[PDB]
Design an enzyme around this catalytic site. Structure first.
Site, PDB file in Angstrom:
ATOM      1  N   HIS A  38       1.776 -18.065  14.082  1.00 16.16           N
ATOM      2  CA  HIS A  38       1.727 -19.517  14.000  1.00 16.16           C
ATOM      3  C   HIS A  38       2.110 -19.694  14.878  1.00 16.16           C
ATOM      4  CE1 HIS A  38       1.476 -19.264   8.916  1.00 16.16           C
ATOM      5  NE2 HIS A  38       1.141 -18.673   9.424  1.00 16.16           N
ATOM      6  N   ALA A  39       1.042 -20.254  15.584  1.00 18.54           N
ATOM      7  CA  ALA A  39       1.664 -21.403  17.258  1.00 18.54           C
ATOM      8  C   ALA A  39       2.885 -21.929  16.655  1.00 18.54           C
ATOM      9  CB  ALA A  39      -0.008 -22.492  17.737  1.00 18.54           C
ATOM     10  N   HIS A  50      -1.673 -28.896  22.071  1.00 20.00           N
ATOM     11  CA  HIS A  50      -0.922 -29.218  21.688  1.00 20.00           C
ATOM     12  C   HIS A  50       0.694 -28.270  21.580  1.00 20.00           C
ATOM     13  CE1 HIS A  50      -0.129 -31.020  17.809  1.00 20.00           C
ATOM     14  NE2 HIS A  50       0.927 -29.897  17.813  1.00 20.00           N
ATOM     15  N   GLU A  51       0.674 -27.188  22.048  1.00 27.55           N
ATOM     16  CA  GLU A  51       1.821 -26.426  22.387  1.00 27.55           C
ATOM     17  C   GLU A  51       2.534 -27.180  23.352  1.00 27.55           C
ATOM     18  OE1 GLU A  51       3.747 -25.769  20.026  1.00 27.55           O
ATOM     19  OE2 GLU A  51       1.753 -25.449  17.864  1.00 27.55           O
ATOM     20  N   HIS A  96       4.647 -30.328  23.289  1.00 32.94           N
ATOM     21  CA  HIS A  96       4.976 -30.221  23.398  1.00 32.94           C
ATOM     22  C   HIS A  96       6.608 -29.068  23.881  1.00 32.94           C
ATOM     23  CE1 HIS A  96       4.945 -30.885  18.756  1.00 32.94           C
ATOM     24  NE2 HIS A  96       3.949 -29.828  18.622  1.00 32.94           N
ATOM     25  N   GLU A 149       3.815 -35.348  18.438  1.00 26.68           N
ATOM     26  CA  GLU A 149       2.585 -34.118  18.019  1.00 26.68           C
ATOM     27  C   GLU A 149       1.503 -34.637  19.073  1.00 26.68           C
ATOM     28  OE1 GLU A 149       3.370 -31.649  16.291  1.00 26.68           O
ATOM     29  OE2 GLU A 149       5.138 -32.168  15.338  1.00 26.68           O
ATOM     30  N   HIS A 186       3.313 -25.812   4.954  1.00 25.24           N
ATOM     31  CA  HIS A 186       4.233 -27.068   5.742  1.00 25.24           C
ATOM     32  C   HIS A 186       4.850 -27.540   3.938  1.00 25.24           C
ATOM     33  CE1 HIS A 186       1.253 -26.720   8.900  1.00 25.24           C
ATOM     34  NE2 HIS A 186       1.748 -27.728   9.264  1.00 25.24           N
ATOM     35  N   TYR A 223       1.625 -36.330  11.397  1.00 25.79           N
ATOM     36  CA  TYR A 223       0.202 -35.684  12.062  1.00 25.79           C
ATOM     37  C   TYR A 223      -0.650 -36.987  11.746  1.00 25.79           C
ATOM     38  CZ  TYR A 223       2.653 -30.779  11.715  1.00 25.79           C
ATOM     39  OH  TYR A 223       3.424 -30.193  12.488  1.00 25.79           O
TER      40      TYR A 223
HETATM   41  C1  D0Z Z   1       9.025 -23.704  15.993  1.00 26.30           C
HETATM   42  S1  D0Z Z   1       9.869 -25.867  16.175  1.00 26.30           S
HETATM   43  O1  D0Z Z   1       9.988 -26.450  14.750  1.00 26.30           O
HETATM   44  O2  D0Z Z   1      10.756 -25.567  17.131  1.00 26.30           O
HETATM   45  N1  D0Z Z   1       8.832 -26.463  16.954  1.00 26.30           N
HETATM   46  C2  D0Z Z   1       8.034 -27.378  16.401  1.00 26.30           C
HETATM   47  C3  D0Z Z   1       7.128 -28.500  17.664  1.00 26.30           C
HETATM   48  C4  D0Z Z   1       7.759 -28.924  17.749  1.00 26.30           C
HETATM   49  C5  D0Z Z   1       9.252 -30.481  16.766  1.00 26.30           C
HETATM   50  C6  D0Z Z   1       9.797 -31.431  16.790  1.00 26.30           C
HETATM   51  N2  D0Z Z   1      10.999 -31.842  16.501  1.00 26.30           N
HETATM   52  C7  D0Z Z   1       6.277 -26.716  16.126  1.00 26.30           C
HETATM   53  O3  D0Z Z   1       6.105 -25.494  17.099  1.00 26.30           O
HETATM   54  N3  D0Z Z   1       5.821 -26.807  14.644  1.00 26.30           N
HETATM   55  C8  D0Z Z   1       4.534 -25.867  14.911  1.00 26.30           C
HETATM   56  C9  D0Z Z   1       3.844 -26.686  14.202  1.00 26.30           C
HETATM   57  C10 D0Z Z   1       2.024 -25.596  14.163  1.00 26.30           C
HETATM   58  C11 D0Z Z   1       0.650 -26.767  13.902  1.00 26.30           C
HETATM   59  C12 D0Z Z   1       0.693 -26.949  13.010  1.00 26.30           C
HETATM   60  O4  D0Z Z   1       1.601 -26.992  11.360  1.00 26.30           O
HETATM   61  N4  D0Z Z   1      -0.255 -28.170  12.626  1.00 26.30           N
HETATM   62  C13 D0Z Z   1      -0.664 -29.004  11.159  1.00 26.30           C
HETATM   63  C14 D0Z Z   1      -1.250 -30.759  11.922  1.00 26.30           C
HETATM   64  C15 D0Z Z   1      -2.693 -29.981  12.713  1.00 26.30           C
HETATM   65  C16 D0Z Z   1      -1.727 -30.584  13.602  1.00 26.30           C
HETATM   66  C17 D0Z Z   1      -3.026 -30.356  15.028  1.00 26.30           C
HETATM   67  C18 D0Z Z   1      -4.313 -30.737  14.663  1.00 26.30           C
HETATM   68  O5  D0Z Z   1      -5.407 -30.501  14.940  1.00 26.30           O
HETATM   69  C19 D0Z Z   1      -4.567 -30.176  13.470  1.00 26.30           C
HETATM   70  C20 D0Z Z   1      -3.500 -29.986  12.049  1.00 26.30           C
HETATM   71  C21 D0Z Z   1      -1.495 -27.332  10.342  1.00 26.30           C
HETATM   72  O6  D0Z Z   1      -2.049 -26.791  10.998  1.00 26.30           O
HETATM   73  O7  D0Z Z   1      -1.603 -28.383   9.264  1.00 26.30           O
HETATM   74  C22 D0Z Z   1      -0.671 -25.530  13.890  1.00 26.30           C
HETATM   75  C23 D0Z Z   1      -1.454 -25.208  14.732  1.00 26.30           C
HETATM   76  C24 D0Z Z   1      -0.822 -27.036  15.387  1.00 26.30           C
HETATM   77  C25 D0Z Z   1       0.837 -27.161  15.507  1.00 26.30           C
HETATM   78  C26 D0Z Z   1       3.497 -27.652  15.191  1.00 26.30           C
HETATM   79  O8  D0Z Z   1       3.407 -27.692  17.002  1.00 26.30           O
HETATM   80  O9  D0Z Z   1       3.189 -29.045  15.696  1.00 26.30           O
HETATM   81 ZN    ZN Z   2       3.234 -30.129  17.052  1.00 28.87          ZN
END
Ligand code: D0Z
Ligand code: ZN
Ligand SMILES: *[C@@H]1O[C@H](CO[C@@H]2O[C@@H](C)[C@@H](O)[C@@H](O)[C@@H]2O)[C@@H](O[C@@H]2O[C@H](CO)[C@@H](O[C@@H]3O[C@H](CO[C@H]4O[C@H](CO)[C@@H](O)[C@H](O)[C@@H]4O[C@@H]4O[C@H](CO)[C@@H](O)[C@H](O)[C@H]4NC(C)=O)[C@@H](O)[C@H](O[C@H]4O[C@H](CO)[C@@H](O)[C@H](O)[C@@H]4O[C@@H]4O[C@H](CO)[C@@H](O)[C@H](O)[C@H]4NC(C)=O)[C@@H]3O)[C@H](O)[C@H]2NC(C)=O)[C@H](O)[C@H]1NC(C)=O
Ligand SMILES: *[C@@H]1O[C@H](CO)[C@@H](O[C@@H]2O[C@H](CO)[C@@H](O)[C@H](O)[C@H]2NC(C)=O)[C@H](O)[C@H]1NC(C)=O
Ligand code: CL
Ligand code: CL
Length: 586
Positions: free
Chosen positions: A314-315, A344-345, A348, A372, A474, A484
């Site tokens: 996972h990203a 997106h990443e 961060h 985000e 999640h 989000y």
């Molecule tokens: C591992 S950590 O905790 O140290 N760092 C966090 C980020 C910093 C937190 C600061 N405190 C981290 O890397 N998290 C992973 C998470 C993964 C994604 C995720 O789950 N997205 C959700 C919601 C979504 C988001 C955008 C989108 O277009 C569509 C859906 C999903 O897929 O349902 C999957 C790809 C997009 C993000 C992320 O980047 O936010």
């Molecule tokens: Zn994110």
């Protein structure tokens, strides 16, 4: 004494930098190389960080924050007083850590098998089916099978998870875990503010829903789509129906205005994961924002290894809490969707770099939604047909009204469709945590909200033992989700403000802020605040006003709202789902 509090905060910062850096390393080493040994080391570092949190949190609670004059020190000490799970007694803490690990593992190893056939993993096998199949029964096999194998297997753990995470919240002064999570926004009016935003997006969502419903009726047949009811939840191109852009082929407003196959274009032109991240890096530095350090390129995991390691694909973006070491871990695939995820990443990562000089306790976003939003703001510009043509991934689509409406529909299938889903997830969890949903009605209440907010129904009636929330990452990973919803609203506010800073005129959805130093300066001032100030200050630095507002998102989509209303009116659509009790007969 002010002086004793200052000393404490300095000692907390030094020791936290060391302990958090060690935990980040061990977690990274597990995530990029899953073994018994790396799990063992991670477990040890988890206990080391708990002991550190307990030590310093206990000390912090000896301070009467009311008597502290310096507001920064007051803020840090108040936050360190929240021990989170480290407030649990020893037995409960061991049990909680083990339940979290068991839920995450259960989700990650679940597969769906044909008898005497192949077994499919969620990613990419089942998500590819959901994205590409146009056969009701094949979609149903993947949708139901994933819930049968992942969701049902999480149910055994979830009541005890709720008990333990609520107990930790109460031991930190909250009334339940949902209260604790909401407090991250420091906004007493949060629930009403979010509800108001949701309501502002109803005209757009209901019109998109009705138009898509009509298109699904055309493809899947009148016997399977009720034009006055909710949409079957397995037909939207995505396992959770959270974004709908994979069914663009079924709903394209102007089929006569075709669009290039962007995946085939990226493959033909030799795009790689590293190129995708270099393009994101380039967008950030075009705004005058920070490049990722050389260390990022050496240590990041930007595609799946081929050396026999097993990894978490996972990203994700990682702060190692030393001001120098920032990494992305992503099993990147060469397509436009993952180009957006890369941005997106990288947002961060940018935020990590911008606030790296603050005390580690203030090294977070203004609120979690801000963290985000950053990358998605740049991705909005990347996604414009203008910019995609400059990457040679689209033929010229400018001018044409048909291409214009087609583009807005593509964007709406993700950005608008996601608004009710992202609202739903923690509306459900807040009510589990506050005890108004019990394990007797977890699943029924989930589907009540899937209906109320998204206008979806399950294609197969649910049964006892189903736990469909557990089939969404999640939930077993205990990652809050309202961030989000916030992000998808405010990223349009940020886009609007940066477009104005860059001197853009004309329709907001045509704006591309590439190379705007004025736009970069707005974002940088805000990001550098980290979590040092109430988030309305960062909101004002970016947008000139302090509130969350859906107006920018509505302005972006205004031409589509107009088109949808005209189209839905001439077909006589009944918006919503007054026949909300309808579910599939076969
Ligand atoms: C591992 S950590 O905790 O140290 N760092 C966090 C980020 C910093 C937190 C600061 N405190 C981290 O890397 N998290 C992973 C998470 C993964 C994604 C995720 O789950 N997205 C959700 C919601 C979504 C988001 C955008 C989108 O277009 C569509 C859906 C999903 O897929 O349902 C999957 C790809 C997009 C993000 C992320 O980047 O936010
Ligand atoms: Zn994110
Ligand atoms: C209430 O207390 C808070 C907190 O106080 C702090 O914490 C407590 C616990 C005690 O330790 C205090 O001694 C300590 O000060 C007070 O808030 C602080 O107020 C001071 C003002 O006195 C601010 O000073 C600024 O700090 C920044 C950032 O400093 C970090 O990063 C620097 C760069 O890497 C580094 O040099 C610092 O050592 C520090 O390092 C980091 O420290 C954190 C822990 O705090 C640690 O986690 C990190 O790991 C660590 N990182 C590294 C790499 O070591 C500093 O950059 C500022 O310098 C600018 O500002 C000066 C004043 O204007 C100016 O003279 C300088 O030249 C420089 O100016 C800028 O220069 C550029 C280009 O040259 C120019 O373009 C700019 O315009 C110019 N700026 C101008 C003109 O303004 C400065 O030293 C603290 O940031 C601040 N801290 C926080 C968290 O807010 C608060 O004042 C107190 N309130 C009251 C009412 O008294
Ligand atoms: C994957 O993890 C294993 C387990 O930690 C690593 O194996 C260790 O490698 C070092 C040498 O660098 C040895 O000192 C250890 O004794 C090894 N442990 C075991 C159990 O074999 C391995 O190096 C990691 N692989 C990668 C590519 O990072
Ligand atoms: Cl579901
Ligand atoms: Cl959140």
């Amino acid at each position: 004494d002010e002086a004793e509090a200052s000393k404490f905060v300095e000692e907390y910062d030094r020791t936290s930098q060391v302990v958090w850096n060690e935990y980040a390393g061990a977690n990274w080493n597990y995530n990029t190389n899953i073994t018994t040994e790396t799990s063992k080391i991670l477990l040890q570092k988890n206990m080391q960080i708990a002991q550190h949190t307990l030590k310093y949190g206990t000390q912090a609670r000896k301070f009467d924050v009311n008597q502290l004059q310096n507001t920064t020190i007051k803020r840090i000490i108040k936050k360190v007083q929240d021990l989170e799970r480290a407030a649990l007694p020893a037995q409960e803490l061991e049990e909680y850590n083990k339940i979290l690990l068991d839920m995450e593992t259960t989700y990650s190893v679940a597969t769906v098998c044909h008898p005497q056939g192949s077994c499919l993993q969620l990613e990419p096998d089942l998500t590819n089916v959901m994205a590409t199949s146009r056969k009701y029964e094949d979609l149903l096999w993947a949708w139901e099978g994933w819930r049968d194998k992942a969701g049902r297997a999480i149910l055994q753990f979830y009541p005890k998870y709720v008990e333990l995470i609520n107990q930790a919240a109460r031991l930190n002064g909250y009334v339940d875990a949902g209260d604790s999570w909401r407090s991250m926004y420091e906004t007493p009016s949060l629930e009403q503010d979010l509800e108001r935003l949701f309501q502002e997006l109803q005209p757009l969502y209901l019109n998109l829903h009705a138009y898509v419903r009509r298109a699904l009726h055309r493809h899947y047949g009148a016997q399977h789509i009720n034009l006055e009811g909710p949409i079957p939840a397995h037909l939207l191109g995505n396992m959770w129906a959270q974004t709908w852009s994979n069914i663009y082929d079924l709903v394209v407003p102007f089929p006569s205005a075709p669009s290039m196959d962007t995946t085939e274009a990226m493959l033909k032109q030799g795009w790689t994961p590293r190129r995708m991240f270099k393009e994101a890096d380039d967008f950030f530095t075009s705004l005058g924002l920070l490049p990722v350090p050389p260390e990022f390129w050496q240590k990041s995991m930007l595609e799946k290894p081929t050396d026999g390691r097993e990894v978490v694909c996972h990203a994700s973006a990682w702060d190692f809490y030393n001001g120098k070491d920032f990494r992305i871990k992503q099993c990147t695939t060469v397509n436009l969707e993952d180009l957006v995820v890369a941005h997106h990443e990288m947002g961060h990562i940018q935020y990590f770099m911008q606030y790296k000089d603050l005390p580690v306790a203030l090294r977070e976003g203004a609120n979690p939604g801000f963290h985000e939003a950053i990358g998605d703001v740049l991705a909005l510009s990347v996604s414009t047909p203008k910019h995609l043509h400059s990457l040679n991934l689209l033929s010229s689509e400018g001018g044409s009204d048909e291409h214009d409406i087609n583009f807005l529909m593509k964007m709406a299938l993700d950005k608008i469709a996601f608004i009710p889903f992202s609202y739903l997830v923690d509306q459900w969890r807040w009510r589990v945590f506050d005890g108004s949903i019990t394990k007797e009605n977890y699943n029924q209440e989930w589907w009540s909200l899937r209906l109320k907010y998204q206008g979806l129904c399950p294609p197969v009636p649910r049964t006892q033992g189903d736990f469909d929330p557990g089939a969404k990452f999640h939930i077993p990973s205990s990652v809050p989700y309202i961030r989000y919803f916030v992000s998808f609203i405010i990223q349009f506010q940020f886009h609007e403000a940066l477009c104005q800073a860059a001197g853009h005129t004309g329709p907001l959805h045509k704006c591309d802020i590439y190379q705007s130093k004025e736009a970069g300066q707005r974002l940088a001032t805000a990001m550098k605040l980290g979590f040092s100030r109430p988030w309305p200050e960062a909101m004002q630095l970016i947008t000139g006003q302090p509130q969350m507002s859906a107006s920018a998102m509505l302005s972006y989509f205004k031409p589509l709202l107009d088109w949808l209303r005209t189209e839905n009116e001439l077909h006589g659509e009944k918006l919503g789902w007054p026949q909300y009790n309808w579910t599939p007969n076969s």
